Amino acid sequence: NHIDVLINGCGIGGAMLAYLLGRQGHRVVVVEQARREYARNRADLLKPAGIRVVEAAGLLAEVTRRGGRVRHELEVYHDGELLRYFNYSSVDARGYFILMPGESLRRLVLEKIDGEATVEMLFETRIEAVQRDERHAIDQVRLNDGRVLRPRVVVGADGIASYVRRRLLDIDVERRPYPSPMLVGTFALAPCVAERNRLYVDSQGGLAYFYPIGFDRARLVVSFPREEARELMADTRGESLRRRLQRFVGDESAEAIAAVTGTSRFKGIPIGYLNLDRYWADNVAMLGDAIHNVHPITGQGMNLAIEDASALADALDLALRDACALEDALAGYQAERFPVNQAIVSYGHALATSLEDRQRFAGVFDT
Numbered sequence: 098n099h100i101d102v103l104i105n106g107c108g109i110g111g112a113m114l115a116y117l118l119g120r121q122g123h124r125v126v127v128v129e130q131a132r133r134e135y136a137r138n139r140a141d142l143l144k145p146a147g148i149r150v151v152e153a154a155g156l157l158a159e160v161t162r163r164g165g166r167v168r169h170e171l172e173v174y175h176d177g178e179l180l181r182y183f184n185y186s187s188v189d190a191r192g193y194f195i196l197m198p199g200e201s202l203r204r205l206v207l208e209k210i211d212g213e214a215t216v217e218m219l220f221e222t223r224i225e226a227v228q229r230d231e232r233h234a235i236d237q238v239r240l241n242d243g244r245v246l247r248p249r250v251v252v253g254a255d256g257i258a259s260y261v262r263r264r265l266l267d268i269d270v271e272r273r274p275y276p277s278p279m280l281v282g283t284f285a286l287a288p289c290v291a292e293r294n295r296l297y298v299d300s301q302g303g304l305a306y307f308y309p310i311g312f313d314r315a316r317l318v319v320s321f322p323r324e325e326a327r328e329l330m331a332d333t334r335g336e337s338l339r340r341r342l343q344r345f346v347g348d349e350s351a352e353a354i355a356a357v358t359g360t361s362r363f364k365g366i367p368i369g370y371l372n373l374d375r376y377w378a379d380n381v382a383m384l385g386d387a388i389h390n391v392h393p394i395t396g397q398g399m400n401l402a403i404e405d406a407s408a409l410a411d412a413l414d415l416a417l418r419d420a421c422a423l424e425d426a427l428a429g430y431q432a433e434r435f436p437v438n439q440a441i442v443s444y445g446h447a448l449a450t451s452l453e454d455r456q457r458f459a460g461v462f463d464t
């Protein structure tokens with residue numbers, strides 16, 4: 098019952114870590130509270146560095162074979178006029194980004210994990226108790242199915258409300274909510290949306306981001322002040338919302354507005370603002386939403402989870418092969434990832450807090 102790594106959470110971050118460790122021959126058990134099939138809303142965006150991880154995992158061809166989309170442009174509008182146009186490929190060819198539903202990528206990764214004999218995935222399972230040795234390393238973990246494991250390393254890949262973080266490391270985080278919630282819905286795909294990603298914001302705090310997802314659908318991400326968001330999402334046949342959009346979303350996206358046939362399918366997007374001071378303690382490390390929360394206006398939750406996963410895999414690989422002490426490996430992991438995650442956490446908060454003020458908002462983008 099000795100294992101190398103116990104991963105708490107089989108979300109995109111934990112799955113990626115499991116596969117990368119598995120590919121190297123390490124003995125991994127992944128504990129996931131939900132069913133494997135269980136499919137929810139999630140982030141959709143892979144940035145260049147996340148794409149490089151997927152390429153290194155041998156998955157990049159399959160991503161677009163499974164309905165992932167390469168893109169290289171964004172338009173940003175404020176009060177119905179074009180504020181910025183970005184071409185991410187103008188100077189660098191690999192500047193492109195990918196839109197891929199997080200759950201489709203996760204499914205792809207789990208398919209690959211099935212093939213890795215040294216990884217065992219336990220769905221509808223949880224950690225029940227842990228014991229620490231005299232050096233305060235976790236040396237034994239009891240699951241809720243009675244299974245006892247003896248892992249060298251424990252990883253929290255268990256998301257924004259992380260059990261590992263809160264219950265195994267006793268870290269609490271103070272969370273002050275933003276005044277505008279975010280919601281996401283999935284609609285039919287209009288030609289304007291297939292053509293180009295378009296983000297719209299206005300002086301009264303509206304936001305509407307339209308982008309294609311999968312083969313034949315479109316995502317619409319919206320934000321409004323809390324009270325107004327409730328009012329709009331109550332005319333469930335969507336006339337109120339459509340009218341609201343028409344105030345700040347121009348004719349280029351008329352068919353994308355018309356695709357918003359009702360509001361019942363909208364789901365709230367969790368919002369945090371966090372970059373933890375410590376990514377690890379003892380033989381416990383964390384990744385993704387367990388250590389940082391970026392405002393979802395950035396779309397980068399999945400991206401940074403995958404980036405973390407790759408860096409942690411490299412660190413744990415070195416430690417498990419005896420090339421460096423676990424404590425040095427984990428320090429190196431944090432040193433690499435903390436400033437990258439920090440930059441995006443600061444950027445998201447900047448965008449979300451500035452979007453009513455046109456040149457201020459413009460100012461955040463330029464950087």
Ligand SMILES: Cc1cc2nc3c(=O)[nH]c(=O)nc-3n(C[C@H](O)[C@H](O)[C@H](O)COP(=O)(O)OP(=O)(O)OC[C@H]3O[C@@H](n4cnc5c(N)ncnc54)[C@H](O)[C@@H]3O)c2cc1C
Nearest residue numbers: 106108109110130138139140255256260385386396398402
């Ligand atoms: C409902 C929803 C909608 C979202 N929509 C968007 C969006 O439109 N745009 C966007 O940019 N971002 C969105 N996000 C955020 C984005 O999905 C995350 O930032 C990203 O998936 C974080 O990756 P992760 O791997 O760190 O954690 P998660 O994806 O949170 O994965 C954590 C995993 O750990 C499991 N888990 C949690 N606690 C335990 C436990 N005690 N024991 C065992 N397993 C556990 C979970 O069931 C889950 O599978 C959304 C998130 C949610 C929940």
